[PDB]
Amino acid sequence: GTPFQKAAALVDLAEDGIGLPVEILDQSSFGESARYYFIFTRLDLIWSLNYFALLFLNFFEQPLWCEKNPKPSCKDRDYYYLGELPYLTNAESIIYEVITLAILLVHTFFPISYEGSRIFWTSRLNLVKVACVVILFVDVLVDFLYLLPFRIAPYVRVIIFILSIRELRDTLVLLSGMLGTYLNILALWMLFLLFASWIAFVMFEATQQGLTVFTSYGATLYQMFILFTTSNNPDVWIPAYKSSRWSSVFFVLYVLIGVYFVTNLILAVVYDSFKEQLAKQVSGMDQMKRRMLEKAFGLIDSDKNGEIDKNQCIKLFEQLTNYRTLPKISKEEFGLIFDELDDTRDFKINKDEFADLCQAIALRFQKPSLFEHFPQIYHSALSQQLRAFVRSPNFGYAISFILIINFIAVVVETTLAIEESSAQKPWQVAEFVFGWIYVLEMALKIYTYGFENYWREGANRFDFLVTWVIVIGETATFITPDENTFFSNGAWIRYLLLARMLRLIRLLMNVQRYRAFIATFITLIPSLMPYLGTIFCVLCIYCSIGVQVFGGLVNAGNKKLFETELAEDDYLLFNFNDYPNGMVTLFNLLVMGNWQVWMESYKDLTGTWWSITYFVSFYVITILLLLNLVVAFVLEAFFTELDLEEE
C-alpha cells in the first residue's frame, strides 16, 4: 500500500465528508477499493442525471384520482382544469421506473465493493438509503403485480433525492437543530393570537361586527390569523368601522403591532437560530478537516523530520491529481502551489503549515498565445497600431456608441411591431450588419488577448456563447428568405428580438454603481441554491399531499365549487389536480397574494375544518421558516457587501 495513495484519499476526505472511510486506509487490499471508487466517481454525472430524472418523474405521473373511475375519464384535460403536460401510460411508466430503479440499485449497492462488508451495514445513512430503495422496489413490484390505499413512491423518491445531495442533508440537519427555538417562538406567536382574538371576541360580543365575523372564538381566531397575514386588512373590520369609527383604532393597533413587532421578531429569531446552527456545523466540519489533514501529514512523513521537501510533495500532487472531486491542477502549478504553501520560506512545509492545502489548491487562476507562431504578421505597423487601439480606453467608447446605435435601431424596429415582414427586411439586414460587427469585435478581442487568456475568465466564455448563438440565429434567418415553418414563424422573430434586447442589457454594466449590484446578485445566486432546493423539495412533498387529499374536488361540473372564492376570483386554473398545477398553486400561496382564497375554498369542498391544517402548516413551515431564511440571506449579503465598499 503506497502511503501517497492513502494521503490522497485522506485529502479527498478532508476537502469534504464524502470519501473513503478512515477504517479502510491501513487494511490490506487497498488498491482494489481505490480502483472501484475511482470508477464509481467517473459516473457522478450519470448518477446526478438519474437522480434528477427520478425526481422529475413526479411531474408526469398519472394522478391517483384518475386511477379510479370518474364519470368522465380524465383524458378530457379541460373538464378538471388540468393541462399541458403528457401522461405516461402503464408501459411507459413501468419501463421508466425500472430503468431508474436499476440505476439506483447499482448506485446504492455498489459501495459494498470498496467499503468491505461490515462497514457498509454499520452506517446510518447507508441503512436509510437501502431502506428507501427496498421500499421503492416493493412498491414498483406491487404496481407490476396489480397490473391500495395510496402510493408511497413520490415521498420515498423525494427523500432519496434529498439525501443524495450533501447540501440538502445539511439543510435538513440545520432545520432539525432550529426546530426547538422555532417552536418556542411559535408558542409566543400563538399566545398573542389567542389573547388578541379573545379580546376581540369579548369586545365585539353583541355588536354588528360580532354577529357577522367574530361569531365564536374559533371563527375569531381564524379571522385574526388571516388578518395577521394582512391578506384581508380592510375587509375583515368593515362592519366594525361602519358601526363605530372608533373601533378602527383597535384594529389599527392590532395590525401594526402584529405586522411590525411580531413579524420582524419571528424573522430575527429564525435568523439567530440558523446562524448558531451554521456556526456549530461549520465548527464540526472544520475540526474534522483539521484532524484529517493532521492524519494525512503524519502518514506522509515516515521519516519524522517534521517537514515535507520538494519531490515528496510533488509526488503527492500527481498521486492526488487522479480524483475528479478535486480542482484541476497543471504541471507548473505543482511548483506554484508548493511555493505558495510555504509561509516561513524554507523550501519545506510544516505540520501546521500543511493544514492549509484545501484552500491553497484552488487559489491560483492565473497564467502565451498561439498567434505568435508567425512573427511577420503579429509584429507589423498596422498590427501594432491596431493593438494600440484595442487597449485604448476609447475602444470602450466606440463599443458603447455602437451599442447606443443598436439600441435606437431595436427601439424603432419594435415601434413597427404591428406591420408585416414586408418592410422588416431593411431592419433585418441592418441587424445582420450589427451582429456581424459584434462578431468582428469578439474575433478582434480574441486576436489581441490570445486564446487561453480569452478562455480563463468565465464571463468572456458567456459572451463567446451568446455572440455565437445570436449570430447563427441571425444567419439562419437571413440565408433562408423563403417562407418556412422554422424561419418565417413569429416565434423565431420574437426570439431574435429578445436576443438583441439582452445584447442591449449589456450596456447597463457601464454604470459602476449598478454593475456592483448586479455582480452582487449574480455572486449571491450560487450560494442560495441549497435553500431554494430545500424549498423546492418541501413544495414537492406538499404537492404530493395535496394531490392525495384534494385530488379532484375542482371540476367543471361541481356544484359547491362555484359558491367558493376560488371560482369567483377566476383562479380555477390554480388548483391541486395535477403535479404542475400544485407547483404553481404553492407558488401563489408562496407569496401571500390572495392566499386565503384557496384556504377558504378547499375548506368548503372538503367539508371539514381539518383541511386548513394543510394550509396553516404550509404557511407556518414555508413562509415563516424558509422564506424568512432566504430573505435573511439576501439582506445579509447586501448589508455585508454594502459595508464592504465603504470599509
Residues that bind Ca ion (CB under 5 A): 12, 15-16, 18-19, 301, 303, 305, 325, 344, 346, 348, 350
Q: How far apart are CA 586 and CA 626, in angstroms?
A: 14
Task: Indicate which of Ca ion, a second copy, none lies near residue 588 (CB less than 5 to 8 Å, by partner kind).
Answer: a second copy
Closer to Ca ion by Cβ: residue 355 or 630: 355
Q: Burial, 50: exposed, middle or buried (Cβ in 10 Å; 0-12, 13-18, 19+)?
A: buried
Grid cell for residue 335: 511548483
Q: Any bridge partners for residue 308, and if so which?
A: 349
* Helix 217-228 and helix 166-203, axial crossing angle in degrees, nearest 10: 130
Task: Indicate which of a second copy, Ca ion, none lies near residue 591 (CB less than 5 to 8 Å, by partner kind).
Answer: a second copy
Contact residues for 579 (Cβ-Cβ < 8 A; gap 6+): 58, 59, 60, 61, 63, 85, 543, 547
Nearest distance from residue 329's CB to a second copy, in Å?
36
Nearest distance from residue 281's CB to Ca ion, in Å?
17
Closer to Ca ion by Cβ: residue 34 or 625: 34
Grid cell for residue 276: 448558531
Nearest distance from residue 338's CB to Ca ion, in Å?
11
Closer to Ca ion by Cβ: residue 297 or 598: 297
Task: Indicate which of a second copy, Ca ion, none lies near residue 519 (CB less than 5 to 8 Å, by partner kind).
Answer: none
Closer to Ca ion by Cβ: residue 18 or 99: 18
Task: Indicate which of Ca ion, a second copy, none lies near residue 350 (CB less than 5 to 8 Å, by partner kind).
Answer: Ca ion
Q: How far apart are CA 416 and CA 420, in angstroms?
A: 9
| Residue 330 falls in which region: left (phi positive, over 0), alpha (psi -120 to 50) or beta | beta
Single-letter amino acid, residue 513: R
Closer to Ca ion by Cβ: residue 16 or 441: 16
Nearest distance from residue 25's CB to a second copy, in Å?
39
Task: Indicate which of Ca ion, a second copy, none lies near residue 348 (CB less than 5 to 8 Å, by partner kind).
Answer: Ca ion
Nearest to 546 by CA among 494, 484, 513, 589: 589
Nearest distance from residue 420's CB to Ca ion, in Å?
60
Q: Burial, 457: exposed, middle or buried (Cβ in 10 Å; 0-12, 13-18, 19+)?
A: exposed
Closer to Ca ion by Cβ: residue 301 or 565: 301
Secondary structure (3-state) at 238 = helix
Nearest distance from residue 272's CB to a second copy, in Å?
5
Closer to Ca ion by Cβ: residue 288 or 567: 288
Closer to a second copy by Cβ: residue 104 or 589: 589
Nearest distance from residue 129's CB to Ca ion, in Å?
18
Nearest distance from residue 606's CB to Ca ion, in Å?
49
Task: Indicate which of a second copy, Ca ion, none lies near residue 489 (CB less than 5 to 8 Å, by partner kind).
Answer: none
Task: Indicate which of Ca ion, a second copy, none lies near residue 12 (CB less than 5 to 8 Å, by partner kind).
Answer: Ca ion
Q: In which residue are the cell numbers 456608441 written?
A: 401
> If you count them, how many residues does the chain have?
647
Instruction: Reduce the secondary structure of 176-203 to three states and give it as a string.
Output: HHHHHHHHHHHHHHHHHHHHHHHHHHHH
Task: Indicate which of Ca ion, a second copy, none lies near residue 18 (CB less than 5 to 8 Å, by partner kind).
Answer: Ca ion
Contact residues for 396 (Cβ-Cβ < 8 A; gap 6+): none
